[PDB]
Amino acid sequence: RKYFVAANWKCNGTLESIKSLTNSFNNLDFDPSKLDVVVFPVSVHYDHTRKLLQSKFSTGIQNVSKFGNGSYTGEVSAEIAKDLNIEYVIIGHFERRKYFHETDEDVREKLQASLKNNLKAVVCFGESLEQREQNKTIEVITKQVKAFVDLIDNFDNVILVYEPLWAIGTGKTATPEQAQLVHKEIRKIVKDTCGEKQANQIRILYGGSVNTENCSSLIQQEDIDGFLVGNASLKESFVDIIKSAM
Amino acid sequence: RKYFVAANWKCNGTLESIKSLTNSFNNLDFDPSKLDVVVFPVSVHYDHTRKLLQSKFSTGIQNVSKFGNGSYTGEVSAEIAKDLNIEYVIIGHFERRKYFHETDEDVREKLQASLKNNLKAVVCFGESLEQREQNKTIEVITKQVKAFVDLIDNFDNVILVYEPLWAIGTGKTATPEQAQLVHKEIRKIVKDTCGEKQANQIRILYGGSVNTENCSSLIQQEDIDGFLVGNASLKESFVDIIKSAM
């Protein structure tokens, strides 16, 4: 399984800043045929980033519409993402599940639009603090996954990401092994709703806080196939994280 | 005062369709100092459009984040737009109030955010079929207007837009004379809480269905200063609409 290393710049950046960060990322010489590296900039920051990052790097956008083209002010569609050659899309990131009310229903509609236009989706999920304290993890992750897992046609064009929300700001932090458990559990869920084969080929990323100190300790985990890094990806040392996957 | 005319492409357009159109747009010789003509392409189309369209044409985005920069996957913060030199932004467009639960609170917030970053806004609002149908347009409009209007300090950088939602859809169509009324009321509300000066200098575009055949009928109205043209702006004929205002 090809390790997956994604950079989620979220809503951050300035022309000059990306210039620096990208020029930095370029220095690391990696073989994309062995490893996948994806940086997701800000909608309006896309064309800037793409023309700065050497092709070895892959790029997507942090979001896609649930509708096709038409009267949907403020929305970018998979239709457009395609004609613009954007290769990946993040869907269901908890930050949009929270501040914007996106739902499983929406994530399904979004996953479907993307695959129909040949986009590659990086779909996210993960139980909450309260949900975990109710020993309802496996349960939630199943309801979540089973909400779109049926739409995947080619298990190399859809990337799963686990977001341990139960830690998102509480001093807490999933141990490289605690994450590992949920992971292997996600995959099982995949096995029994798609087939032993499928699950052994779909990549499942970690979503918790990632960085230089734990990256290698994480990727090394049995069922963690890389990660969707947040703030650590806005610093030039991010190259160190990519390495841990080389 | 200065007539304002904008093209709201919404979620429509490919790299080529835009190349071609924009060109059909350049041909029209108008003074950008006597009239305002603004185009709003899809986020991942701003750069492409901006470069292809000439200076006489102002360009902007269709939505701006209510939050500043930070962990907000999927959003575009006003500051990022300021660093990008995006001059205009649309806010509270009914489609975003509907499909996405944007509120009067949000609008208020995004406007205050846009202005902090020297952006120029085109804020939208209007009542529903049920609301007009129960005689309340003036009650609604005032609320929606009193909701954010006070933030305005330079009555040239914020442009109000009315949207006859009660028609939009209902196979109906507000008449020029009707639109005019609502417009004089909006103006008044601007006056009542900002002063005659502010009031008589702010522009209030139409926002209902505008086309090569009724633009005249509306612009002519004395409380109509231009419009937020939809589908028609995807055609080369849009120019004739700019013309109705020059």
Write the DSSP string, A91-121: E--HHHHHHT---HHHHHHHHHHHHHTT-EE
Q: Is A7 near chain B, with CB under 8 Å?
A: no
Q: Which amino acid is at B88?
A: Y
Q: Which chain B positions have a beta carbon within 8 Å of A47's beta carbon?
A: 44, 47-48
- Could you give the CA distance from residue A42 to residue B63 in angstroms, rounded to a whole number? 13
Owner of token pair 């790029």: A59
Q: Which residues of B are annotated as a binding site?
A: 8, 10, 169, 228, 230-231
Q: After which residues is chain A broken (C to N over 2.5 A)?
A: none
Q: Which of B36, B18, B26 is nearest to B87 (CA)?
A: B36
Of B44, B45, B62, the CB nearest to A61: B44
CB contact under 8 A, B11 and A76: yes
Tokens for B67, please give them: 């939050």
Structure tokens at A167: 């830690």
Contacts of residue B48, Cβ cutoff 8 Å, sequence gap at least 6: A47, B15, B18, B41
Q: What is the CA angle B146-B152-B157, rounded to 5? A: 125
Q: Using an 8 Å Cβ cutoff, are A82 and A94 in contact?
A: no
Pairing of strands B226-229, B204-205: unpaired
Print the SS3 string covering B111-156: HHHHHHCCCEEEEEECCCHHHHCCCCHHHHHHHHHHCCHHHCCCCC
Cβ A58 vs Cβ A88: under 8 Å: yes
Active site residues of A: 93, 163
- The reply to whether B16 belongs to the active site is no
To the nearest whole Å, the CA of B140 is away from the closest chain A CA by 22
Please tell me the distance in Å from A93's CA to the nearest CA on chain B. 7
Catalytic residue from among B102, B163, B183, B185: B163
Residue B62: list chain A partners with CB under 8 A: 73-74
A20 touches chain B (CB under 8 A): no
Cβ <8 Å between A10 and B72: yes
Please tell me the distance from the alpha carbon of residue B99 to that of residue A30, in angstroms, as a whole number. Answer: 42
> What's the rounded Cα separation, in Å, for the pair A157 and A32?
15
Categorise residue A101: left if φ over 0, alpha if ψ from -120 to 50, beta otherwise: left
| Distance of residue B126 Cα from the nearest chain A Cα, in angstroms | 16
* Helix, strand, coil percentages, rounded to 5, for chain B: 45, 15, 40
CB A63 within 8 Å of CB B39: no
Cα angle for residues A175, A176, A177 (degrees, 5° grid): 85
Which are the contacts of A236, defined by CB distance < 8 A and separation ≥ 6? A20, A21, A24, A25
Sequence-distant (≥ 6) Cβ neighbours of residue B20 within 8 angstroms: none
Distance from B113 to chain A by nearest Cα, in Å? Answer: 15
* Residue B179 CB contacts under 8 Å (≥ 6 apart), including other chains: B162, B164, B206, B208, B218, B221, B224
CA distance B147 to A170: 36
Mutation target vs A (from B14, B63, B73; most A CBs, 10 A cutoff): B73
Show Cβ contacts of residue A189 under 8 Å, excluding neighbours closer than 6 positions.
A141, A142, A145, A146, A149
* Residue B83: half-sphere exposure toward Cβ, Cα within 13 Å: 17
Amino acid at B198: Q
Q: How far apart are CA B127 and CA B144, in angstroms?
A: 9
For residues A156 and A122, give the distance between their C-alpha atoms in angstroms, rounded to a whole number: 11
In sequence order, what are the beta bridge partners of A58? Answer: A38
Which amino acid does the sequence have at A180?
Q
Which residues is B229 bridged to in the sheet?
Answer: B7
- If 0-12 CB within 10 Å is exposed, 13-18 middle and 19+ buried, where does residue B67 land? middle
Bridge partners of B158, per DSSP, are: B121
Specify the pairing of strand B160-162 against strand B204-205.
parallel
Cα B20–Cα B21–Cα B22 angle in degrees, nearest 5: 95
Q: Alpha carbon of A217 to those of A90, A224, B81, B161: distances in Å?
A: 25, 10, 38, 55
Backbone angles phi, psi at A110, to 5 degrees: -75, -40
Measured N-to-C along each axis, helices A176-191 and A137-145 cross at an angle, to the nearest 10 degrees, of 50
CA separation for the pair B24, B47 (Å, rounded): 18
Question: What does the alpha-carbon distance between residue B179 and residue B164 come to, in Å, rounded to a whole number?
Answer: 8
How many Å apart are CA B53 and CA A27, to the nearest integer? 35
User: Under the phi-then-psi rule, with left for phi > 0, alpha for psi from -120 to 50, and beta for the rest, what region is A54?
Assistant: beta
Q: Scan for tokens 């950008």, then name that residue.
A: B32
Do the Cβ atoms of B112 and B79 come closer than 8 Å? no
Q: Is residue A78 within 8 Å of residue A65, measured between CB atoms?
A: yes
Q: What is the resolution of this structure in A?
A: 2.8
Whether B82 contacts chain A with CB within 8 A: no
Rounded to an integer, what distance in angstroms lies between the CA atom of residue B183 and that of residue A195?
62
Distance CA B204, CA B220 (A): 13
**Which of B61, B74, B99 is the closest to A62 by Cβ?**
B74
| A176 contacts A210 by C-beta, under 8 angstroms | no
Residues of chain A with C-beta less than 8 angstroms from the C-beta of B46 = 44
- Walk across the sheet containing B3-8 and list its strands: B204-205, B160-162, B120-125, B88-91, B58-61, B35-40, B3-8, B226-229
Q: Are B83 and A12 in contact (CB under 8 A)?
A: no
DSSP states along B24-53: HHHTS---TTTEEEEEE--GGGHHHHHHHS
Instruction: State the Cα–Cα distance between residues B164 and B178, nearest whole angstrom.
Output: 10
All structural domains of chain B: 1-246 (3.20.20.70)
Cβ atoms of A204 and A170 closer than 8 Å: no
The structure tokens listed for A182 are 């949920």
Cβ atoms within 10 Å of A54's Cβ, excluding its own: 11
Nearest Cβ partner of A10 from B46, B71, B99? Answer: B71
> What method was applied to determine this entry?
X-ray
Contact B59, B46 (CB under 8 A): yes
Task: Give the span between the Cα atoms of A18 and A40, in whole angstroms.
Answer: 12
How many whole angstroms separate alpha carbon B107 and alpha carbon B125? 10
The number of helices, as runs of H, and strands, as runs of E, in chain A is 11, 8
Q: Tell me the nearest-neighbour CA distance from A228 into chain B, angstroms.
A: 12
Helical residues (DSSP H) of B53-133, grouped into ranges? 78-84, 94-98, 104-116, 129-132
Tokens of B195: 């002063």
* A75 with B42: Cβ contact below 8 A: yes
Q: In a mutagenesis test of the A interface, which of B11, B117, B165 is the best target, namely the one with the most A β-carbons within 10 Å?
A: B11
The phi, psi pair for A34, rounded to 5°, reads: -115, -25
Other C-beta atoms lying within 10 Å of the C-beta of residue A13: 24
Instruction: Please tell me the distance from the alpha carbon of residue A189 to that of residue A177, in angstroms, as a whole number.
Output: 19
Residue A38 near residue A4, CB atoms below 8 Å: yes
Residues 6+ apart with CB under 8 A from B159: B4, B120, B121, B122, B123, B202, B203, B204, B205
d(CA B100, CA B102): 6
Contact assessment for residue B127 and residue B141, using Cβ atoms and an 8 Å cutoff: yes
Q: What are phi and psi of B7, to 5 degrees?
A: -105, 115
A8: β partners: A40
Contacts of A83 in chain B (CB under 8 A): 14-15
Look at A44 and B46 and tell me if their CB atoms are within 8 Å: yes
How far apart are the C-alpha atoms of B13 and B41, rounded to whole Å?
Answer: 8
